[PDB]
Amino acid sequence: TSVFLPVFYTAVFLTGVLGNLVLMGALHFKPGSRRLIDIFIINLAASDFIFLVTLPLWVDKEASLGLWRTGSFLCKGSSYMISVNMHCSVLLLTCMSVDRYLAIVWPVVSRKFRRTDCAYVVCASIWFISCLLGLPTLLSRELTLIDDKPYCAEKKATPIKLIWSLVALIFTFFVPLLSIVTCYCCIARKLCAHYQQSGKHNKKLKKSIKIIFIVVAAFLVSWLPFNTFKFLAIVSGLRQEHYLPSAILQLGMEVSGPLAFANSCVNPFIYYIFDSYIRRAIVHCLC
Amino acid sequence: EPRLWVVPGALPQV
Amino acid sequence: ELDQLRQEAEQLKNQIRDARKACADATLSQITNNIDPVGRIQMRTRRTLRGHLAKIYAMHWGTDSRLLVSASQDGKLIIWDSYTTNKVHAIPLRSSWVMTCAYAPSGNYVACGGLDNICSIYNLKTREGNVRVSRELAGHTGYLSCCRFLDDNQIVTSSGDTTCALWDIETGQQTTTFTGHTGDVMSLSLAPDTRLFVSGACDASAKLWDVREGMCRQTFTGHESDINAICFFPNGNAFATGSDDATCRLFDLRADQELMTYSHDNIICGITSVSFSKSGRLLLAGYDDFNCNVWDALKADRAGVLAGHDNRVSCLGVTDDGMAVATGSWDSFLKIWN
Amino acid sequence: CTLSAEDKAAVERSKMIDRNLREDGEKAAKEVKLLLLGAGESGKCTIVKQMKTGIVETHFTFKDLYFKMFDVTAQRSERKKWIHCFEGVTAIIFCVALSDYDLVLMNRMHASMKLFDSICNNKWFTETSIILFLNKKDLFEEKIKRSPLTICYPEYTGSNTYEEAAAYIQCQFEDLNRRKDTKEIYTHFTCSTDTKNVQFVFDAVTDVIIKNNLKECGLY
Amino acid sequence: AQARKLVEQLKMEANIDRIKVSKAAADLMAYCEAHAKEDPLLTPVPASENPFRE
Amino acid sequence: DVQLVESGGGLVQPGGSRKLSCSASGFAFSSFGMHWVRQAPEKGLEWVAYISSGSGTIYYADTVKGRFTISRDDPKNTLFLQMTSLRSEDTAMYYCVRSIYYYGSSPFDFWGQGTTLTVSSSDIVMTQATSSVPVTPGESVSISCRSSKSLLHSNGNTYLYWFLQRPGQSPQLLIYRMSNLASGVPDRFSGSGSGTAFTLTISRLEAEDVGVYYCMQHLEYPLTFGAGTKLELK
C-alpha cells in the first residue's frame, strides 16, 4: 500500500512522460498535409502530459504519511491542474469518438460539417470550459498544519455543492460515456456487417474492430469505477437516510485513482502499436 | 465534520 | 550512308564544341567577386489564396500585376484578385486533368491545358454573364504541358508529343509547327519583345526557336537531367532552366555557353518552376522539398528561403513590375511574397 | 468599414463562387474514380463492354453508387510525367490476358509483369489498391493442352492443369507487391456475364473506400 | 531524310558568328546595376505604397 | 439577343397594387444585379430598388421604403416589383437595369425598354451647372457635374458614371469609373475628374450625340442621379 502506490505512480509518470515526448517529437516535425485526427491526438497528448508532470511532487504525500515538505503553494496549483486535465481527458475522448462516428458511419453529411478551424475552435472552447469547471477545485484545496501538516485537505461540501457536483458529473462523464458507447457500438456493428459478407480482403479489418474493442474495454475498466463510486458517495450524502456506509467507498476512490493514471499513460502506447503513419513517424524522428 | 478536514486524495473527490 | 552521316555529325559536333571552348577564358565565378554583399531577403506571406480543392499545376501573372489565374485539377479555373483576395471568375472545365494555363496580355482571353490533347482557350470579356469556350483547338498528339499568349490572336502551345506549335484563334490550325525535339517538351518562355522563345524538354536540352522563322536557331546543352522549368532574363538575352538534378543553370543567348551552376550538397530534389526578378538579380526556384529557395543571379549564393507550403511547390510567378512573388504548391494553396 | 459599394458586391460574388465550388467538390467526391491500365494490346475493353484525344472517360451508375474510369492508351508518352493527375484514385484496374504466355510481341507476359511491378511499386502509388483482371479464360482452357506453362515460366514444376496454372499465375502476379502492409491486390477471373465482371468491382470498391476512410481517421 | 535535316540544322547552327563572353558579362552587370533601384524585391520598400500589407 | 422586356402599367387608382415583370433573355440571369431606376415624366432619374445575385442583399430607396417589394425568379429569368399603397408620386417611367460587380466590371451597361405606369390624381446630391447648351455639329462639348462629397476612395479609383438618354429610347452608359469607356462607346467620348469636380468632353458630334446627359455616383445606397444636360441642335 504505502509502497505499492508510490512505485506505480512513478512508473506511470515515467512511461507517460516518455510516450508523450516521443509522440511530440514524432508528430511535431513532419512533411505532408495536416490531418483532422492529428490535432485531436496532439491536444490529448498535451492534456495528458501536464496530467502527471507534478505527479512526482504528489507521491511524497503517499510515501510515508501525508508529507508535503516541498512547499505550500504547489498543492493548490497541482490540484487545479490535475482536476483540469481530468476534466479534459474524458471530454476529448468523447469528442474523438463522435468525430470517428461521423467520419465512418455517415461520411455524407459530416464530410463538410467538420473542418480544421472548427475543430481548433472546439478544442479552444473545450479547454476553456474545462478550465472554468476546475475553478472550484482551486479554491477548495488548502493547507491545515494543525498537526505538523497532516495532509492537504478541504471541507467536504454543502448540499447545494453536492447537487452541483452531481449535475457536473452527469453532464461531463455520464452523457459522454453513453455517447462513446453508442458511437463505438454502431461503428462495430457496421464493421461486422461489412465483415460478414463473403469478400476477398475483408478479413484484414480485424485490426480496426480489435482496436475499438480494446479502447472501449480500457475506458470502461478505468474511468467507470471512480465515477460510479463517487456518484454513490453524493447520492448517499444527499439521501440523509441510514445508508451511510463505511470507508468501503473511501477505499474505492483511492485505489481507483491510479487506474485513471494508467489509462492516461497507456494511451500513446496503443497509438504506437496498433496504428500506422505515426508508427513510421516515430522511427523516422528518433533515428 | 468540517473541522475534520477530510483528505480527497489524488483525483478530485466529491 | 549511316556511317558517313554519323562521322559527319561527330566531326561537326567536335568543331562546334571547339568553337564554344574558344570563347571561354574568364569564367563568371571570378568575375563577380568584387561587389557589395547582398543581405538576406526575408519574404513573408502577404496574402493567402484559398478555394482550390485539388493540386495546382500552373499559373500566370497578369500585366496589371493584380489579376492571376490558377490551374487546378478539380475542374475549375479561378481568376484571383491578389490585392483583396477575390475570385473574379470561376470557369467550369469539362475535364479535371489540367496541366497548364495561360493569361493573355489583354484581359479578354484565358488559356488552359489538360490531358485531352486539346487547347482550352476561353473568353472572359463577353456580352453574356458567363465564361464560354471561345475555341477548342485540337491537333496535338501529346499531353498539354505549357502554353503562353504572345498577341491577342497568336499563341505558342507545347504538347507532350516532343513538338510545339503556333496556333490561331479564328482558324484553329497550326500556323507553324516546331519539330526537332528528341524528347518531350514541358515548358517554354517568351522574350519581352515577343520575337524569340526557348523551350525545355526531357532530353536534357533547351533550344531557341523563332516564331516568325519557325525553326530552331540556337541549341543549348550542359544539363545532366530533364529540364522542367525555364524563364527568360528581363533583359532578353539570357534565360535560366530548372532541371531535376537539383541544379539551376543560366544560359545566355549571346555566348552560347553555360555561365555557372547553382549546386548545394544538401538537396537532391529537382526544380519545378524558375522565375527572375525585376532587375534579374534574384532567381528563386521552386524545389520539391516542400519549399522554395532564392538564388543569387551573379554570386550563386542563397539569400533567402521561402517556406510555408504543406506539399511540393510547382507554381512560381513574378509580376511584370517585379513587386510581388506568388507561389503555388500541391496543397491547393497560393502564397504571395513581397 | 473601409469597403466601398463595389467591394461589398465583389465579396458577395466571391462567397457565391466559393459555395458553388464547395458544392461541386462535395458532389464530385461522392463519385468513384478508377484508372484503367494494361500492357500492349491488353484487353481493357472488357469492362466498358460489360458496363456502359489522349484520355477518354467512361461512366455508369449503380444502386446508390457512381463510377468514372479513365483510359490513357492514347498517351504514348513518358508515363512518369503525366501520372501525377491520377493520385488519390479509389483503385487502379489492371487488365492482363492469360493468353500471352507464348505469344511474342520477348514474351508479352514479361512486359505485363514489368508494367505491373513498375506501377504497383511506385512513389505516387502507395495508398491505392490495384484490381487485376484475367481475360480470355476459354482460350487459355483450349491452349493449356496444346502448350504448357513452362514456356513462359521455367520454374514451373506442376501438372499442366487449369487450377494449378491459375493459382501459379495468381501468386506470381501477387508476389510483386513490396508494399503489402498498405496496398492490396484484387485478382478475379473475368467471365462472359456482364454482372459477374463488375460485381467484383463493386465488392472491391466498397471495401477499398472503407479501408481508406479507416486509415484516414486513424482506426486502421 | 532525317539525317539530311539534322546535318542541315547543325550546319546553320555552326553558321552563326561567335562573340566574346566578357562583353555579355559586362552587359549583364550593367543591366543588374541599372534596374536595381526600381526593384521592389532586392531594395526594401516602405509600407506606404504596398497594397499587399495587412 | 439580350433584351429586358417590361410588362405591366397603365391607369391605376390610388391606393392599390400593380404587378411588374422583367423577363430577361439572351444572358444568364444568375450573376447580374437588378435595378429599378425610375425616370419622371418631365425629367430626372432616381434609383428605386436593387437586388444582388442570389437575392443576397436587397436595397430600397428612402421614398419607396416600406411599400416596395422586389424579387427575382432565377429559373424563369424574371424580376418582380410588386408594390402596395400606390400614390400619385408613383407616376413615372419604370426601367429595368442590369449590372455586374467585379474587378473591371461595367455596371449599368444595359437598360430595359421601359414600361409606363400612371396613377390618377446625408444623401449625396449631384448638381449640374447648366441644363441647355447651344451646340452645332462638329463642336466640342464640356459637360460638368459636381458632387457634394469627395468620390475618391482609398483604393485610388473614382466612382463616377455617365449616361446618354436619346429621345424615345433608353439611357445608355458612356463612361464608368470616370476613366473607363463603356462597350460600344466611340473614341470621341472621354472623361476626367479630380474627386470633387468632374468634366465630360465630346468632340466632333455629328448627329447621334443628342439627348439628355445623366451623371451619377456609386458610393452609397441612395445612388442619386443628376439633373439633365439637354443639348439643342440649334
Coordinates of C-alpha atoms in Angstrom, one line a residue, chain C residues 12-257:
Chain C
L12 CA 30.7 18.9 -86.8
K13 CA 29.9 18.4 -83.1
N14 CA 33.6 18.5 -82.2
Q15 CA 34.0 21.6 -84.3
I16 CA 31.1 23.2 -82.6
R17 CA 32.4 22.2 -79.2
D18 CA 35.9 23.6 -80.1
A19 CA 34.3 26.9 -81.3
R20 CA 32.4 27.1 -77.9
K21 CA 35.6 26.4 -76.0
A22 CA 37.4 29.1 -78.0
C23 CA 35.1 31.7 -76.4
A24 CA 35.7 30.9 -72.7
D25 CA 38.7 32.3 -71.0
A26 CA 37.4 34.2 -67.9
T27 CA 34.5 32.4 -66.1
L28 CA 31.8 34.3 -64.3
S29 CA 32.8 32.7 -61.0
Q30 CA 35.8 35.0 -60.6
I31 CA 34.2 38.0 -62.4
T32 CA 31.6 38.7 -59.7
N33 CA 33.9 38.5 -56.6
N34 CA 34.1 42.4 -56.4
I35 CA 30.6 43.6 -55.4
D36 CA 28.8 44.7 -52.2
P37 CA 27.4 41.6 -50.4
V38 CA 23.7 41.2 -50.7
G39 CA 21.8 40.8 -47.4
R40 CA 19.3 38.1 -46.6
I41 CA 15.9 38.7 -48.1
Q42 CA 13.1 37.8 -45.6
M43 CA 9.9 37.3 -47.6
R44 CA 6.6 37.0 -45.7
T45 CA 3.2 35.7 -46.9
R46 CA 1.4 38.9 -47.5
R47 CA -1.8 37.3 -48.9
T48 CA -3.0 33.7 -48.9
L49 CA -5.4 32.5 -51.6
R50 CA -7.9 29.7 -50.8
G51 CA -10.7 27.9 -52.6
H52 CA -8.9 25.2 -54.6
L53 CA -9.9 21.6 -53.8
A54 CA -7.1 19.9 -55.8
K55 CA -3.4 20.3 -56.7
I56 CA -2.2 23.4 -58.6
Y57 CA 0.0 22.8 -61.6
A58 CA 0.4 26.1 -63.4
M59 CA -0.4 29.8 -63.0
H60 CA 0.3 33.1 -64.8
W61 CA 0.6 36.7 -63.7
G62 CA -1.4 39.4 -65.4
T63 CA 0.1 42.5 -66.9
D64 CA -1.7 44.7 -64.4
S65 CA 0.1 42.8 -61.6
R66 CA -3.2 42.4 -59.9
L67 CA -5.1 39.5 -61.7
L68 CA -3.7 36.0 -61.7
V69 CA -5.2 32.7 -62.9
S70 CA -4.5 29.4 -61.2
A71 CA -4.9 26.0 -62.8
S72 CA -6.1 23.1 -60.6
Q73 CA -7.3 19.5 -61.2
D74 CA -10.7 20.0 -59.6
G75 CA -12.3 21.0 -62.9
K76 CA -12.3 24.8 -62.1
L77 CA -10.3 27.8 -63.3
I78 CA -10.2 30.8 -60.9
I79 CA -9.2 34.4 -61.6
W80 CA -7.7 35.8 -58.4
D81 CA -7.6 39.4 -57.3
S82 CA -4.4 39.4 -55.3
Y83 CA -5.0 42.9 -53.8
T84 CA -8.2 41.9 -52.0
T85 CA -8.3 38.1 -52.3
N86 CA -11.4 37.9 -54.5
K87 CA -12.4 35.4 -57.2
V88 CA -13.3 37.4 -60.3
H89 CA -14.4 34.3 -62.2
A90 CA -14.8 30.5 -61.7
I91 CA -14.6 28.9 -65.1
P92 CA -16.1 25.4 -65.2
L93 CA -14.0 22.8 -67.1
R94 CA -15.2 19.7 -68.9
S95 CA -12.0 17.8 -67.8
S96 CA -10.2 17.6 -64.5
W97 CA -6.7 16.8 -65.8
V98 CA -5.3 20.3 -66.0
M99 CA -1.6 20.6 -66.5
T100 CA -1.0 24.2 -67.7
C101 CA -2.7 27.6 -68.1
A102 CA -2.0 31.0 -69.6
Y103 CA -3.3 34.5 -69.3
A104 CA -3.4 36.8 -72.3
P105 CA -1.7 40.2 -72.0
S106 CA -5.1 41.8 -72.8
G107 CA -7.5 40.8 -70.1
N108 CA -10.0 39.2 -72.5
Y109 CA -8.9 35.6 -73.2
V110 CA -7.6 32.9 -70.9
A111 CA -6.0 29.6 -71.9
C112 CA -5.8 26.2 -70.2
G113 CA -4.3 22.8 -70.6
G114 CA -5.2 19.2 -70.0
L115 CA -4.7 15.6 -70.8
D116 CA -7.2 15.7 -73.7
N117 CA -4.6 16.8 -76.2
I118 CA -6.7 19.9 -76.9
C119 CA -6.5 23.6 -76.2
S120 CA -8.7 25.3 -73.7
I121 CA -8.8 28.9 -74.6
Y122 CA -11.9 30.7 -73.1
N123 CA -13.2 34.3 -73.4
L124 CA -13.7 36.4 -70.3
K125 CA -14.9 39.8 -71.7
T126 CA -18.2 38.8 -73.4
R127 CA -21.7 40.3 -73.5
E128 CA -23.0 37.2 -71.7
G129 CA -22.8 36.8 -68.0
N130 CA -20.8 33.6 -68.0
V131 CA -17.4 32.5 -69.4
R132 CA -17.8 30.4 -72.5
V133 CA -15.2 28.5 -74.6
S134 CA -14.0 30.7 -77.4
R135 CA -12.4 27.9 -79.5
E136 CA -11.4 24.3 -78.9
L137 CA -8.1 23.9 -80.7
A138 CA -7.2 20.3 -81.4
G139 CA -4.5 18.7 -83.5
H140 CA -1.9 17.7 -80.9
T141 CA -1.0 14.0 -80.1
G142 CA 0.8 14.9 -76.9
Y143 CA -0.3 16.0 -73.4
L144 CA -0.6 19.7 -72.8
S145 CA 2.4 20.9 -70.7
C146 CA 2.8 24.6 -71.4
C147 CA 1.1 27.4 -73.3
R148 CA 1.7 31.1 -73.5
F149 CA -0.1 34.0 -75.2
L150 CA 2.0 36.2 -77.5
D151 CA -0.6 38.5 -79.0
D152 CA -4.3 38.7 -78.8
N153 CA -4.5 36.2 -81.7
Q154 CA -1.2 34.3 -81.6
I155 CA -0.3 31.6 -79.1
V156 CA 2.5 29.1 -78.8
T157 CA 1.4 25.7 -77.4
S158 CA 3.7 23.0 -76.0
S159 CA 2.5 19.4 -76.1
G160 CA 3.8 16.1 -74.9
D161 CA 4.5 14.6 -78.3
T162 CA 8.0 16.1 -78.5
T163 CA 6.8 19.0 -80.6
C164 CA 5.5 22.6 -80.3
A165 CA 3.1 24.6 -82.5
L166 CA 1.8 28.1 -83.0
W167 CA -2.0 28.4 -83.2
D168 CA -4.5 31.0 -84.4
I169 CA -7.8 31.6 -82.7
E170 CA -10.1 32.0 -85.7
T171 CA -8.7 29.3 -87.9
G172 CA -7.9 26.8 -85.2
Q173 CA -5.0 25.4 -87.2
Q174 CA -1.2 25.2 -86.5
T175 CA 0.2 28.2 -88.4
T176 CA 3.8 26.9 -87.7
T177 CA 4.9 23.6 -86.2
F178 CA 8.1 23.3 -84.3
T179 CA 9.8 19.9 -84.8
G180 CA 13.2 18.6 -83.8
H181 CA 13.0 17.8 -80.1
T182 CA 14.2 14.3 -79.4
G183 CA 12.3 14.3 -76.1
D184 CA 9.0 15.6 -74.8
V185 CA 8.9 19.4 -74.1
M186 CA 7.5 20.5 -70.8
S187 CA 7.8 24.3 -70.6
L188 CA 8.5 27.4 -72.6
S189 CA 9.2 31.1 -72.0
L190 CA 8.6 34.2 -74.1
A191 CA 11.1 37.0 -74.6
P192 CA 10.0 40.6 -73.6
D193 CA 10.0 41.8 -77.2
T194 CA 7.9 38.7 -78.3
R195 CA 10.3 37.7 -81.1
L196 CA 12.2 34.6 -79.8
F197 CA 11.2 31.8 -77.4
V198 CA 13.0 28.9 -75.8
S199 CA 11.5 25.6 -74.6
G200 CA 12.8 23.0 -72.2
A201 CA 12.4 19.3 -73.0
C202 CA 13.1 16.0 -71.2
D203 CA 16.1 15.3 -73.4
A204 CA 18.3 17.4 -71.1
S205 CA 18.4 20.3 -73.6
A206 CA 16.8 23.7 -74.2
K207 CA 16.6 25.0 -77.8
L208 CA 15.8 28.5 -79.1
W209 CA 13.1 28.9 -81.7
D210 CA 11.9 31.9 -83.8
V211 CA 8.2 32.4 -84.1
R212 CA 8.4 34.2 -87.5
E213 CA 11.0 31.9 -89.0
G214 CA 9.5 28.7 -87.4
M215 CA 12.7 26.7 -87.0
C216 CA 15.3 26.0 -84.3
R217 CA 18.1 28.6 -84.3
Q218 CA 20.3 28.0 -81.2
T219 CA 20.8 24.8 -79.2
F220 CA 21.9 24.8 -75.5
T221 CA 23.3 21.8 -73.6
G222 CA 25.0 21.1 -70.3
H223 CA 22.3 19.8 -68.1
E224 CA 22.6 16.3 -66.6
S225 CA 18.8 15.6 -66.4
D226 CA 15.5 16.5 -67.9
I227 CA 14.6 20.2 -67.8
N228 CA 11.2 21.0 -66.2
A229 CA 11.3 24.9 -66.0
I230 CA 12.6 27.8 -68.0
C231 CA 12.3 31.6 -67.9
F232 CA 13.9 34.5 -69.8
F233 CA 16.1 37.1 -68.4
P234 CA 14.5 40.6 -68.0
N235 CA 17.0 42.0 -70.5
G236 CA 16.0 39.3 -73.0
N237 CA 19.5 37.9 -74.0
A238 CA 19.7 35.2 -71.4
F239 CA 17.5 32.6 -69.6
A240 CA 17.6 30.0 -66.8
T241 CA 16.4 26.4 -66.7
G242 CA 15.4 24.3 -63.8
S243 CA 16.2 20.6 -64.2
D244 CA 15.6 17.5 -62.0
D245 CA 19.2 17.1 -61.0
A246 CA 18.8 19.8 -58.2
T247 CA 20.9 22.3 -60.2
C248 CA 19.8 25.6 -61.8
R249 CA 21.8 26.6 -64.9
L250 CA 21.6 30.0 -66.6
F251 CA 22.2 30.1 -70.4
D252 CA 22.8 33.3 -72.4
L253 CA 21.7 33.6 -76.0
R254 CA 24.8 35.6 -76.9
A255 CA 27.8 33.5 -75.6
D256 CA 26.0 30.1 -76.3
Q257 CA 27.6 28.8 -73.1

